[PDB]
């Protein structure tokens, strides 16, 4: 969650940094992100710090 957002970094050449396990989360804002990292991706362009609503992609 955010939570990890909490104290992370990201450049222009180390850019983002996400397992290689993909694991489906829901996000609270009503959408979904595949990776869990990858959640904070999304996270870090739109800027809304979005949170994990639930594990698996959103039903």
């Not at 104290?7 to 959408?31: A, F, S």
């Not at 809304?48 to 959103?58: A, D, P, Y």
Request: hydrophobic fraction near 20%; charged fraction near 25%; aromatic fraction near 6%.
């Amino acid at each position: 969650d955010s939570e990890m957002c909490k104290d992370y970094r990201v450049l222009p050449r180390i850019g983002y940094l996400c397992p290689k396990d993909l694991k489906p989360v829901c996000g609270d804002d009503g959408q979904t992100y595949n990776n869990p990292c990858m959640l904070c991706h999304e996270n870090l362009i739109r800027q809304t710090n979005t949170h994990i609503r639930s594990t698996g992609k959103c039903e």
